[PDB]
Design a protein around this motif. Structure first.
Motif, PDB file in Angstrom:
ATOM      1  N   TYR A  83       2.771   2.998  -2.581  1.00 23.83           N
ATOM      2  CA  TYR A  83       2.996   2.923  -1.018  1.00 23.83           C
ATOM      3  C   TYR A  83       3.047   1.594  -0.696  1.00 23.83           C
ATOM      4  O   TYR A  83       1.848   0.968  -1.077  1.00 23.83           O
ATOM      5  N   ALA A  84       3.814   1.072   0.182  1.00 28.83           N
ATOM      6  CA  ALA A  84       3.640  -0.086   0.840  1.00 28.83           C
ATOM      7  C   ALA A  84       3.661  -1.272  -0.359  1.00 28.83           C
ATOM      8  O   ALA A  84       2.741  -2.115  -0.300  1.00 28.83           O
ATOM      9  N   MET A  85       4.245  -1.071  -1.548  1.00 28.73           N
ATOM     10  CA  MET A  85       4.288  -2.007  -2.529  1.00 28.73           C
ATOM     11  C   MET A  85       2.839  -2.066  -3.019  1.00 28.73           C
ATOM     12  O   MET A  85       2.519  -2.989  -3.631  1.00 28.73           O
ATOM     13  N   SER A  86       1.998  -1.152  -2.590  1.00 32.86           N
ATOM     14  CA  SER A  86       0.488  -1.298  -3.332  1.00 32.86           C
ATOM     15  C   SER A  86       0.292   0.233  -3.674  1.00 32.86           C
ATOM     16  O   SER A  86       0.489   1.239  -3.225  1.00 32.86           O
ATOM     17  N   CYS A  87      -0.465   0.018  -4.819  1.00 30.71           N
ATOM     18  CA  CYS A  87      -0.973   1.454  -5.296  1.00 30.71           C
ATOM     19  C   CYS A  87      -2.176   2.029  -4.585  1.00 30.71           C
ATOM     20  O   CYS A  87      -2.841   1.581  -3.975  1.00 30.71           O
ATOM     21  N   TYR A  88      -2.089   3.530  -4.598  1.00 25.46           N
ATOM     22  CA  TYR A  88      -3.035   4.136  -3.489  1.00 25.46           C
ATOM     23  C   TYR A  88      -3.702   5.422  -4.043  1.00 25.46           C
ATOM     24  O   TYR A  88      -2.515   6.326  -4.541  1.00 25.46           O
ATOM     25  N   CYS A  89      -4.780   5.515  -4.183  1.00 28.37           N
ATOM     26  CA  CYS A  89      -5.133   6.878  -4.986  1.00 28.37           C
ATOM     27  C   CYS A  89      -6.024   7.817  -3.928  1.00 28.37           C
ATOM     28  O   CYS A  89      -6.854   7.001  -3.064  1.00 28.37           O
ATOM     29  N   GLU A  90      -6.133   8.847  -4.036  1.00 25.58           N
ATOM     30  CA  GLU A  90      -6.776   9.689  -3.007  1.00 25.58           C
ATOM     31  C   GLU A  90      -7.761  10.505  -3.679  1.00 25.58           C
ATOM     32  O   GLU A  90      -7.502  11.660  -4.567  1.00 25.58           O
ATOM     33  N   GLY A  91      -9.156  10.349  -3.699  1.00 32.64           N
ATOM     34  CA  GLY A  91     -10.123  11.091  -4.231  1.00 32.64           C
ATOM     35  C   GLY A  91     -11.074  10.067  -4.774  1.00 32.64           C
ATOM     36  O   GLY A  91     -12.007  10.243  -5.720  1.00 32.64           O
ATOM     37  N   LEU A  92     -10.602   8.932  -4.761  1.00 31.95           N
ATOM     38  CA  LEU A  92     -11.708   7.645  -5.560  1.00 31.95           C
ATOM     39  C   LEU A  92     -13.115   7.979  -5.385  1.00 31.95           C
ATOM     40  O   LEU A  92     -13.503   8.674  -4.331  1.00 31.95           O
ATOM     41  N   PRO A  93     -13.989   7.286  -6.059  1.00 33.87           N
ATOM     42  CA  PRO A  93     -15.266   7.374  -6.004  1.00 33.87           C
ATOM     43  C   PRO A  93     -15.630   6.534  -4.895  1.00 33.87           C
ATOM     44  O   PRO A  93     -15.249   5.399  -4.568  1.00 33.87           O
ATOM     45  N   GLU A  94     -16.897   7.152  -4.293  1.00 34.21           N
ATOM     46  CA  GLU A  94     -17.363   6.205  -2.899  1.00 34.21           C
ATOM     47  C   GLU A  94     -17.919   4.794  -3.346  1.00 34.21           C
ATOM     48  O   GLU A  94     -17.903   3.924  -2.579  1.00 34.21           O
ATOM     49  N   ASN A  95     -18.067   4.519  -4.630  1.00 32.72           N
ATOM     50  CA  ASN A  95     -18.322   3.394  -5.244  1.00 32.72           C
ATOM     51  C   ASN A  95     -17.051   2.446  -5.907  1.00 32.72           C
ATOM     52  O   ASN A  95     -17.062   1.825  -6.542  1.00 32.72           O
ATOM     53  N   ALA A  96     -15.949   3.120  -5.639  1.00 36.36           N
ATOM     54  CA  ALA A  96     -14.522   2.497  -6.073  1.00 36.36           C
ATOM     55  C   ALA A  96     -14.274   0.993  -5.582  1.00 36.36           C
ATOM     56  O   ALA A  96     -14.836   0.750  -4.394  1.00 36.36           O
ATOM     57  N   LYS A  97     -13.526   0.011  -6.227  1.00 34.88           N
ATOM     58  CA  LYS A  97     -13.412  -1.362  -5.843  1.00 34.88           C
ATOM     59  C   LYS A  97     -11.909  -0.984  -5.206  1.00 34.88           C
ATOM     60  O   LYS A  97     -11.030  -1.377  -5.804  1.00 34.88           O
ATOM     61  N   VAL A  98     -11.946  -0.883  -3.752  1.00 32.48           N
ATOM     62  CA  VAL A  98     -10.389  -0.949  -3.175  1.00 32.48           C
ATOM     63  C   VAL A  98     -10.461  -1.695  -2.046  1.00 32.48           C
ATOM     64  O   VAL A  98     -11.470  -2.096  -1.429  1.00 32.48           O
ATOM     65  N   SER A  99      -9.496  -1.937  -1.401  1.00 32.95           N
ATOM     66  CA  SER A  99      -9.682  -2.831  -0.043  1.00 32.95           C
ATOM     67  C   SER A  99      -9.598  -1.936   1.291  1.00 32.95           C
ATOM     68  O   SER A  99      -8.862  -0.666   1.282  1.00 32.95           O
ATOM     69  N   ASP A 100     -10.477  -2.181   2.079  1.00 34.02           N
ATOM     70  CA  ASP A 100     -10.464  -1.174   3.234  1.00 34.02           C
ATOM     71  C   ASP A 100      -9.797  -1.660   4.401  1.00 34.02           C
ATOM     72  O   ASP A 100      -9.876  -1.351   5.536  1.00 34.02           O
ATOM     73  N   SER A 101      -8.483  -2.202   4.011  1.00 38.01           N
ATOM     74  CA  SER A 101      -7.484  -2.950   5.098  1.00 38.01           C
ATOM     75  C   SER A 101      -6.250  -2.643   4.592  1.00 38.01           C
ATOM     76  O   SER A 101      -5.746  -3.209   3.400  1.00 38.01           O
ATOM     77  N   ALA A 102      -5.293  -2.234   5.459  1.00 33.96           N
ATOM     78  CA  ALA A 102      -3.796  -1.971   4.960  1.00 33.96           C
ATOM     79  C   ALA A 102      -2.931  -3.516   5.244  1.00 33.96           C
ATOM     80  O   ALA A 102      -2.134  -3.503   4.818  1.00 33.96           O
ATOM     81  N   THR A 103      -4.113  -4.537   5.679  1.00 34.59           N
ATOM     82  CA  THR A 103      -3.178  -5.703   5.942  1.00 34.59           C
ATOM     83  C   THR A 103      -4.120  -6.872   5.278  1.00 34.59           C
ATOM     84  O   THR A 103      -4.545  -7.470   5.928  1.00 34.59           O
ATOM     85  N   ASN A 104      -4.188  -6.945   3.881  1.00 32.41           N
ATOM     86  CA  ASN A 104      -5.222  -7.786   3.229  1.00 32.41           C
ATOM     87  C   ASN A 104      -4.186  -9.060   2.566  1.00 32.41           C
ATOM     88  O   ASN A 104      -2.926  -8.719   2.464  1.00 32.41           O
ATOM     89  N   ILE A 105      -4.943  -9.988   2.289  1.00 29.02           N
ATOM     90  CA  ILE A 105      -4.014 -11.271   1.783  1.00 29.02           C
ATOM     91  C   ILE A 105      -4.859 -11.874   0.564  1.00 29.02           C
ATOM     92  O   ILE A 105      -5.678 -12.335   0.493  1.00 29.02           O
ATOM     93  N   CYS A 106      -4.208 -11.596  -0.667  1.00 32.57           N
ATOM     94  CA  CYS A 106      -5.015 -11.955  -1.866  1.00 32.57           C
ATOM     95  C   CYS A 106      -4.469 -13.614  -2.138  1.00 32.57           C
ATOM     96  O   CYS A 106      -3.301 -13.851  -2.228  1.00 32.57           O
TER      97      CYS A 106
END
Length: 60
Positions: free
Chosen positions: A36-59
């Protein structure tokens, strides 16, 4: 928890197909893995998973 998986740098993983995210997310203990949004998104990840908490980030 749901969110987008990042690489060793912390950048959202770009996705081009749903199947790609489906498998990846699954390995991360996720249930809703899709592209989604050219970005991968998983539903149900672990509370300690490494993901971005913002739909508008810039690497970089």
């Amino acid at each position: 928890k749901d969110g987008y998986p990042v690489d060793s740098k912390g950048c959202k993983l770009s996705c081009v197909a749903n199947n790609y995210c489906d498998n990846q997310c699954k390995m991360k203990k996720a249930s809703g893995g899709h592209c989604y949004a050219m970005s991968c998104y998983c539903e149900g990840l672990p509370e300690n998973a490494k993901v971005s908490d913002s739909a508008t980030n810039i690497c970089g």
